[PDB]
Amino acid sequence: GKIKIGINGFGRIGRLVARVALQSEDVELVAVNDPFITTDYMTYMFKYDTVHGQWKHSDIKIKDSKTLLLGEKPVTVFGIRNPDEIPWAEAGAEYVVESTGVFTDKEKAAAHLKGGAKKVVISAPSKDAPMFVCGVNEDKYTSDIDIVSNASCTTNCLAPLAKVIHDNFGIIEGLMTTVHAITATQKTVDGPSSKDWRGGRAASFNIIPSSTGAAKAVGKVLPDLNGKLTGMSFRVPTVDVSVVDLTVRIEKAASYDAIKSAIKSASEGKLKGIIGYVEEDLVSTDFVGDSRSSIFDAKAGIALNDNFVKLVAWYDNEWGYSNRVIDLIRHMAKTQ
Amino acid sequence: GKIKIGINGFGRIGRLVARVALQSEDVELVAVNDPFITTDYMTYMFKYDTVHGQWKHSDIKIKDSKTLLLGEKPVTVFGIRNPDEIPWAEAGAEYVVESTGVFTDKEKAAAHLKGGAKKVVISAPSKDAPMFVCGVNEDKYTSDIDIVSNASCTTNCLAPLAKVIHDNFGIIEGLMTTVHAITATQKTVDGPSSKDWRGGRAASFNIIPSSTGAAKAVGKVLPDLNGKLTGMSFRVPTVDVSVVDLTVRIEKAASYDAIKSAIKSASEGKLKGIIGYVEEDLVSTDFVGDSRSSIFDAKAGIALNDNFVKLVAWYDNEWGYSNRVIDLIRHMAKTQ
Amino acid sequence: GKIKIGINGFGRIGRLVARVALQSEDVELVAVNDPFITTDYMTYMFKYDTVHGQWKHSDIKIKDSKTLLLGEKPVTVFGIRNPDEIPWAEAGAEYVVESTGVFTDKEKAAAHLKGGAKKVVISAPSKDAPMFVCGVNEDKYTSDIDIVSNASCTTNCLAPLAKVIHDNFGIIEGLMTTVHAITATQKTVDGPSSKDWRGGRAASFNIIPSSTGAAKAVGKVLPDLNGKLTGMSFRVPTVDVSVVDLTVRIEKAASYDAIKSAIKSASEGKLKGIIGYVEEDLVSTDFVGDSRSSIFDAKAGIALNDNFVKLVAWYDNEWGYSNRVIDLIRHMAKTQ
Amino acid sequence: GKIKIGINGFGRIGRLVARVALQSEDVELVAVNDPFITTDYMTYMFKYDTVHGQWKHSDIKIKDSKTLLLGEKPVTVFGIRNPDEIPWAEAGAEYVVESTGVFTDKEKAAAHLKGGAKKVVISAPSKDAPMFVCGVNEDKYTSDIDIVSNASCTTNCLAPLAKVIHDNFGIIEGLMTTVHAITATQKTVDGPSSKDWRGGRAASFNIIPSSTGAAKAVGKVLPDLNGKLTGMSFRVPTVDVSVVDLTVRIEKAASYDAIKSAIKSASEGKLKGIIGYVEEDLVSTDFVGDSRSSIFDAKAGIALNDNFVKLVAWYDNEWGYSNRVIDLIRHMAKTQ
Ligand SMILES: NC(=O)c1ccc[n+]([C@@H]2O[C@H](COP(=O)([O-])OP(=O)(O)OC[C@H]3O[C@@H](n4cnc5c(N)ncnc54)[C@H](O)[C@@H]3O)[C@@H](O)[C@H]2O)c1
Ligand SMILES: NC(=O)c1ccc[n+]([C@@H]2O[C@H](COP(=O)([O-])OP(=O)(O)OC[C@H]3O[C@@H](n4cnc5c(N)ncnc54)[C@H](O)[C@@H]3O)[C@@H](O)[C@H]2O)c1
Ligand SMILES: NC(=O)c1ccc[n+]([C@@H]2O[C@H](COP(=O)([O-])OP(=O)(O)OC[C@H]3O[C@@H](n4cnc5c(N)ncnc54)[C@H](O)[C@@H]3O)[C@@H](O)[C@H]2O)c1
Ligand SMILES: NC(=O)c1ccc[n+]([C@@H]2O[C@H](COP(=O)([O-])OP(=O)(O)OC[C@H]3O[C@@H](n4cnc5c(N)ncnc54)[C@H](O)[C@@H]3O)[C@@H](O)[C@H]2O)c1
């Protein structure tokens, strides 16, 4: 009678993942943990959003501070610093979305089992937890795996696209660039960012080069592409929605129309919901709220010849990924 | 005798105060402390600036992990979290600029004296250290005082303006609004800010109201105006430069031209260098690099009648204030 | 018996007025005129919107040049340059919304009568056309008047609020400042703006002072406030939603709480739908899509004393105003 | 022997080309024509600049209705819309910089000859006028040619880089993406752009795909690369400075250091002043004011293998190109 989940962290991803859950027919958000945000503040951060509008699918109210009330449905609020000490079981949380960004290691993420959780989905890349991307390798998941990663929003955009191109034409080698919206790790004015100097510069007033592991990660969820793709990123002054610029040399000659038709078929086929196809004069804000992992922009791309082409795919880095987090949990729950 | 100074907190103000000092002929930066910026990283943060251009007055290089080197002149660097552990004396710093934003209390600021500093200038309002605004009340400083506040950039903008208006026409009551550039305390995307919820919302994508005691503070540096002013602020999507919007009722009736003439005369005389006067169609970016504390915009303001008007004054919140920090030190150094 | 209307000029206001109309059970959009945008292009500009989202209420298709289909309801498309040649009567448009901005003079707006339109509502201030603001003086409208002005968005925000404060406490004098979103008359980079030099400077990279007659205009819809209000504006880098900052001196002493309760009551009574009331820590994006003309922000304002206060009220300059254009038409149609 | 030049079109390029000329020792600006800017307004537009700061090299005063006076140097101001009518010879303008963007056709730019100018340099690509890029093919120019094109800023950034990579390793094929700053042709809010629908969308609130022939154009100035390059662009929310992202398959295997070394050598030799070389963590604003045509960012790019790599080169789309316009002129004067 519904998949019970808990969310650790309540940032951009934790909050939007909660929105998706609270509005679904099959998943139940039973608890959220966040040591830094009072119960009162939590309701405010959840209700109002600069990018995705006011939550209006249900009204919000405080039952008693250890408790939230979303349209008569309860949601426990924990304020526990040690994951190892979150009583997920007391709330009935089967799955836990680890979305804080500091427990991405399998052994650190594993802490949630201590409190009675049975499954943990890391909402970010992981060095040792298996990564799964819907539409790409989610079928590789098996019930004995308790800690998994849903990879990154960028890998979720690149992988489906690369799979379609590789399966149809054979990818020899490819280089990728993402023109990315700013994020929470960036700064409003030039500030300290010791692990990424460029990343400390005023975010909304600069084009900021940045490294990316999304292309390399593709090789993990699609071994056949390991070592054949790499890339980088440019952080630009936008609040949300990013775009993937994939330049690849393919083995089988294909006209631009053939490539377009392949992506189109896939988007109408088994990858519906994951890959989208568009042929209109759209821009970034037209994709805010789009739940797909990768929306191919047919008119934006360009081919030099039948074996070397540049492909463009949009992605609401916040909302698409958030839906995939729930999508991954759904697949896991259906796997005996 | 060259005034020797140290800086605690190498941020927007710390770094710019460094630029003013390094370009002067009377002040010598001898050391800098910031546990979040290694020596190497410091050369990069000081050299490149999103708003104030590249440093091109002298070369910037590292002598060793503990000393910089600005065109041959040595500047020692520390990485200490607790002020009372900073050996200011060893470096010969007589004056210490407290610009971290977390040690504004007098007793927290006085930690610097333990290490051998003789004077501390807090680059922000202080709860108990006396506040001074150059051109308004710096002459109240007495040498028995070791810890002082240079107030806020906003008070530095409004106070000189109010002084001229009060001395010439007599202020009965006033209400101020500052349309303010974003700062380091804000967030790139909707994030937590437990003590200022609005302040946590995506900075460059919202007009964000905020309270400020900067107007009320004018009453502290000009007691005659106690209880006569207050106001608020709107943080808007710009990287630097803000503006004061003062709606005031005056006792002696005066035409707008009479008010303009009073300010122009003040800018050319007693308050030259503090209050500036312009009569052109300028906009925020035109004031980047302006060293004055308050630049009156003749054409922007409007009078309802001879005793009720709206006055407009610009200020490069980063640069003007940074210069006033040095000016305050110059004045204290000349005292006695 | 729907109210049939036509729209001249398919811009920010024209398109959004069309959205309000198309969503109503009230009025029927029967025709649109714009010689600067093809019929096919028109469907694109109407469908996608950077700030108000994609139109998904009904399907959008082209029937045959000159004819759009929003679901199963036809909308005639004109491409006439001269207003006196638009055969509004052919499409059956009784009311014409003059939203081009270049035909605000009463004589120039009268051209629509030539084509058979019965009434014209200028979606802008007019030098001589009778001005009406809903919730303020729309009851002054008489059926013998065929050309009216719906004022500006700023006056629709300021006037209702002012009426509430004046009737309860008596406004002696006030000065208004509006922190305003950028608009179509502004420029992306420094360019030519002959009648407004500041307004030619890069829009999203500057705080830009501007003159406004919105405060003075209040005197036309509220005689007792004529000559008692004036102000100016600051255009800031946001795409939509602006805020009014009203500093007023009142006759009757009143605590800030009394002022608040007065506005809340009004927002709950006759002025419901025109004046809004909020007391949460909201920011501009939180008001995107708000249909009210003026949303009083309880927590943002501040009082110096019981007779001198600063009040702040938000307004989606695009959406609220567009709804008011339809509300005025609704009132005119219900008038003897 | 001062090279006397005139400028048609006092926009971003015209005004900055003006600044270069006026700060030079070998070029003399003797006349400017722009019927959309009065002599008085012209002084304001030239003096203040959102991106490049206030003009300070010289005073700027008005010597009657036509002549401006810059540091005692008189400059005649014309206000004529039809090129065929500008009396260049009267001012002594030998070379005319055609920077209006509406006379790029050889035949149309030729109009300046009837007025007495002897040479015309089009500050934009031309469909038929011969194009030249300094450091790449300006030596192909011959005195019998009176109308030339300085191509586009993007081609000026990509061409030098392509030349180096091609001369050193051999370019088999390449695909380019430019992350470009907004420009004068874009819109502040969703407005009409019939020839480029995406380009009509709010410029500073969207990532906007854009077509470009800049890469294909490298084939015109570098015949060996004809048909070997193409690409596209993404317009993003910055005021100035853009970047080229070149993905290339090369013939001679070369490690990234060998490539970095080749470019660095070029930047210190034959292409000094044209190609720059950086090895620091820079961001867009760090390049404002850089006069090079293409500045290679060693750390931003990445290599997949010794024959497939992604190269990054910055360019101040306004300043770099403006300097090149003058350089093309200097070359033409020296090869007369
Ligand atoms: N578009 C995106 O933002 C995006 C896309 C894909 C993946 N992600 C992933 O999600 C993470 C980023 O979230 P951010 O926007 O993107 O969201 P935020 O919006 O950065 O998340 C903020 C929340 O994390 C909470 N938090 C911090 N420490 C905590 C702790 N110890 N326990 C509980 N809660 C804690 C904070 O209080 C805050 O409410 C990243 O690690 C990234 O891998 C983000
Ligand atoms: N325009 C302005 O930003 C402006 C104007 C007037 C006054 N101020 C005042 O300046 C502050 C100055 O902040 P910035 O200077 O604006 O913000 P920053 O730019 O956020 O200050 C940055 C630096 O303080 C350093 N720091 C933090 N903790 C420290 C510690 N324990 N020891 C040493 N260094 C430490 C940080 O590492 C960082 O480098 C505030 O308190 C404010 O009221 C700022
Ligand atoms: N926030 C706001 O933008 C706002 C608020 C209140 C009132 N208004 C009013 O609406 C008008 C401004 O609209 P703008 O954004 O604000 O919208 P735009 O978005 O400026 O309107 C643009 C359209 O007007 C069309 N147009 C021009 N000349 C025409 C003609 N002769 N015939 C038919 N169509 C023509 C153009 O082609 C274009 O499509 C102003 O006059 C103002 O009074 C605007
Ligand atoms: N960064 C850049 O913007 C950049 C870089 C390289 C090349 N370019 C190129 O040059 C234009 C550069 O134009 P800009 O951005 O400098 O222009 P702006 O900045 O749009 O140019 C503006 C001026 O041209 C003037 N003008 C228009 N019509 C005229 C006429 N008939 N006679 C005289 N003056 C007239 C206008 O008044 C306006 O002041 C383009 O054609 C483009 O290809 C631009």
Sign of the torsion angle spanned by Cα atoms B204, B101, B287, B315: positive
Can you tell me the distance from the alpha carbon of B336 to that of B332, in angstroms, rounded to the nearest whole number? 8
Which domains, from first to last, does chain A contain?
A: 1-151+318-336 (3.40.50.720), 152-317 (3.30.360.10)
Q: Residue C242: name the closest of C126, C136, C155, C121 by CA.
A: C155
Break chain B down into helix, strand, coil percent, rounded to 5. Answer: 30, 25, 45
SS3 of residue D195 by DSSP: coil
Instruction: Select from A259, A72, A257, A68 the least CA-distant residue to A164.
Output: A259
Token pair recorded at residue D22 = 């006026």
Q: E strands within C181-306?
A: 208-211, 229-235, 242-250, 275-278, 294-297, 302-305
d(CA C330, CA D172): 67
Query: What are the CB-based long-range contacts (under 8 Å, 24+) for C293-297?
Result: C293/C133, C293/C134, C293/C135, C293/C156, C293/C157, C293/C160, C293/C320, C293/C321, C293/C324, C294/C156, C294/C157, C294/C158, C294/C160, C294/C161, C294/C244, C294/C320, C296/C161, C296/C260, C296/C263, C296/C267, C297/B209, C297/C243
DSSP classification of residue C130: P
Which residues neighbour C303 within 8 Å (Cβ) at sequence distance 6 or greater?
A: C255, C256, C259, C309, C310
Asked if residue A164 lies in contact with residue A220, where contact means CB atoms within 8 angstroms, the answer is no
Give the start-end residues of each E strand in chain C.
3-8, 27-33, 60-62, 67-70, 73-78, 95-98, 119-122, 147-149, 171-180, 208-211, 229-235, 242-250, 275-278, 294-297, 302-305, 308-315
What single-letter DSSP state applies at residue A10?
-
Number of H helices, E strands in chain A: 9, 16
Cα A210–Cα A216–Cα A220 angle in degrees, nearest 5:
145
Q: How far apart are CA C137 and CA C163, in angstroms?
A: 10
Chain D residues with CB inside 8 Å of A310's CB? Answer: 175, 177, 231-232, 247
Gap between the Cα atoms of D132 and D221, Å rounded:
6
User: DSSP string spanning D36-50?
Assistant: TS-HHHHHHHHH--T
CA distance D139 to D330: 12
Using DSSP, state whether B61 is helix, strand or coil: coil
B153 is catalytic: yes
Let me know: does B275 contact B160? Beta carbons within 8 Å. yes
3-state secondary structure of B161: helix
Which residues does chain C have within 8 Å of residue D191's beta carbon, measured at their own beta carbons?
Answer: 11, 184
- Beta strand pairing call for C208-211 and C171-180: unpaired
A170: left (phi over 0), alpha (psi -120 to 50) or beta: left
Backbone angles phi, psi at B215, to 5 degrees: -75, -45
Which of helix, strand or coil describes residue A166?
A: helix
CA distance B89 to B74: 15
Q: Residue C251 in contact with residue C169, Cβ under 8 Å?
A: yes
The count of C-alpha atoms lying within 13 angstroms of the C-alpha of A15, restricted to the half-sphere facing its C-beta, is: 24
How far is Cα B296 from Cα D110, in angstroms, rounded to an integer?
A: 49
Cα–Cα distances (Å) from B238 to B54, C22, C236, C237, C238, in that order, read 20, 37, 8, 7, 10
Distance of alpha carbon C281 from alpha carbon C299, whole angstroms: 7
What CA–CA distance (Å, rounded) separates A215 from A227?
9
Q: Is A247 on the interface with D (CB under 8 A)?
A: yes
Rounded alpha-carbon distances, angstroms, from residue C130 to C84, C95, C98, C227, D270:
21, 16, 14, 18, 71
Q: What are the Cα distances from residue B251, in Å, to B173, B306, D68? A: 9, 9, 45
- Joined tokens for residue D139: 């030596």
Reported resolution in A?
2.3
What's the sign of the alpha-carbon dihedral A296, A302, A304, A306? positive
Residue of A nearest to C281 (CA): A44
Q: Of A206, A309, A310, which is closest to D284 when you measure between CB atoms?
A: A206
Provide CB contacts within 8 A for A262, sequence distance 6+: A164, A165, A168, A169, A254
Torsion sign, CA atoms A294, A299, A303, A304: negative
Residues with Cβ < 8 Å from C249, sequence gap 6 or more?
B249, B308, C171, C172, C173, C174, C307, C308
List the single best residue of D188, D235, D316, D322 to mutate versus C (max C Cβ within 10 A).
D188
Q: Which of helix, strand or coil describes residue C334?
A: coil
**Residue B164: φ, ψ to 5°:** -65, -45
**Residue whose tokens read 């024509």:** D33
3-state SS assignment for residue A138: helix
Residue D315: count other Cβ atoms within 10 Å of its Cβ: 29
A236 C-alpha to ligand 4 centroid (Å): 25
- DSSP, collapsed to helix, strand or coil, labels residue C237 as coil
* Among C48, B239, A212, A255, residue whose Cα is nearest residue D208: C48
CA distance C23 to C61: 17
Q: In Å, what is the CA distance from A312 to each residue of A164, A247, A269, D137, D181?
A: 13, 9, 20, 33, 19
- How far apart are the C-alpha atoms of C94 and C329, rounded to whole Å? 10
Residue environment code for C304-322, b if the CB has 16+ CB neighbours within 10 A, otherwise e: beebbbbbbbbbbbbbbbb
DSSP string, A20-58: HHHT-SSEEEEEEE-SSS-HHHHHHHHH--TTT----SS
In order, the DSSP letters of C138-150 are GGG--TT--EEE-
Can you tell me the distance from the alpha carbon of A68 to that of A31, in angstroms, rounded to the nearest whole number?
Answer: 9
Asked whether the beta carbons of B215 and A209 are under 8 A apart, the reply is no
For residue B35, is it left (φ>0), alpha (ψ between -120 and 50) or beta? alpha
D37: chain C residues, CB-CB within 8 Å: 192, 194
Spatial contact of C42 and C60, defined as CB atoms under 8 Å apart: no
Residues 6 or more apart in contact with residue C187 via CB below 8 angstroms: C193, C199, C200, C201, C202, C203, D184, D188
Q: Provide the strand spans (E) within A126-284.
A: 147-149, 171-181, 208-211, 229-236, 242-250, 275-278
Touching C: B residues 290-329, CB under 8 Å: 297, 299-302, 304-305, 308-310, 312
What separation in angstroms does the CA of A161 have from each of A86, A218, A277, B31, C274? 38, 11, 11, 53, 49
Three-state DSSP state, D256 = helix
**H helices within chain A, ranges in order?**
12-22, 39-47, 88-91, 106-109, 111-114, 153-169, 214-221, 256-268, 319-334
* Substitution candidate for ligand 4 out of D100, D239, D242 with most atoms within 8 A of CB: D100
Say how far apart CA C157 and CA A164 lie, in whole Å.
53
Strands, sheet with C147-149, edge to edge from the N-terminal-most edge strand: C60-62, C67-70, C73-78, C27-33, C3-8, C95-98, C119-122, C147-149
* Whole-number Å distance between alpha carbons of D84 and D112: 6
Q: Which residues of C are catalytic?
A: 153
Phi/psi of residue B178, nearest 5 degrees: -120, 130
H or E segment and range at residue A8: strand A3-8
Distance separating alpha carbons of residues C24 and C22, to the nearest angstrom: 6
Chains that touch A (3 or more CB pairs under 8 A): B, C, D
- How many C-beta atoms lie closer than 10 Å to residue D144's C-beta? 5
Interatomic CA distance for residues D242 and B240, integer angstroms = 22
Q: What residues are in contact with ligand 4 under a 6 Å CB criterion?
A: C 192; D 8-14, 33-37, 81, 99-102, 123-124, 152-153, 183-184, 317-318, 321
| Beta-bridge partner residues of B247 | B175, B310
Instruction: Give Rg (Cα) of chain D.
Output: 20
CB pairs under 8 A between C and D: 93
Specify the amino acid at residue A182: I
Pocket probe mutation, ligand 2, options B123, B158, B178, max atoms within 8 Å of Cβ: B123
For D169, the token pair is: 């390793």
User: How far is residue A213's CA from residue B183's CA, in Å, rounded to a whole number?
Assistant: 31
Q: Three-class SS of residue C160?
A: helix
Contact B3, B333 (CB under 8 A): yes
Separation of alpha carbons A146 and A133, rounded Å:
16
Of D332, D327, D271, which is closest to residue D21 (Cα–Cα)?
D327
Determine contact, residues C154/C178, Cβ cutoff 8 Å. Answer: yes
Q: Tokens 């729309």 map to which residue? A: C138
Indicate yes or no: CB of D283 within 8 angstroms of CB of B53.
no
In degrees and rounded to multiples of 5, residue C258 shows phi and psi of -70, -40
Residue whose CA is at the smallest distance from ligand 4 atom 12: D13
Interface of B with C in 179-208 (CB under 8 A): 179, 181, 197-198, 201-202, 204-208
Which residues make Cβ contacts (< 8 Å) with residue B309, sequence separation at least 6? B247, B248, B250, B256, B259, B301, B302, B303, C175
Neighbour tally for D325: CB within 10 Å: 27
Nearest to B162 by CA among B250, B94, B103: B250
Q: Which two tokens stand for residue C51?
A: 């700030």
Å from CA of A10 to ligand 2 middle: 27
DSSP string, D294-328: EEEETTT-EEEETTEEEEEEEE-TTHHHHHHHHHH
Residues with CB under 6 A from ligand 2: A 191-192; B 8-14, 33-37, 81, 99-102, 123-124, 152-153, 183-184, 317-318, 321
Find the largest Cα–Cα distance for chain A.
Answer: 64
Burial class (CB in 10 A: 0-12, 13-18, 19+), C131: buried
Cβ < 6 A, ligand 1 pocket? A 8-14, 33-37, 99-101, 123-124, 152-153, 183-184, 317-318, 321; B 191-192
What are the residue numbers of the active site of D? 153
Smallest CA–CA distance, residue D287 to chain B, in Å, is 9
Q: Confirm if C66 and C77 have CB atoms less than 8 A apart.
A: yes
**Joined tokens for residue A20:** 């998706």
B135-140: Cβ within 8 A, 24+ apart = B135/B159, B135/B160, B135/B163, B135/B270, B135/B271, B135/B273, B135/B274, B135/B275, B135/B293, B136/B160, B136/B163, B136/B221, B136/B222, B137/B221, B137/B222, B138/B327, B138/B328, B138/B331
B292 labelled ligand-binding: no
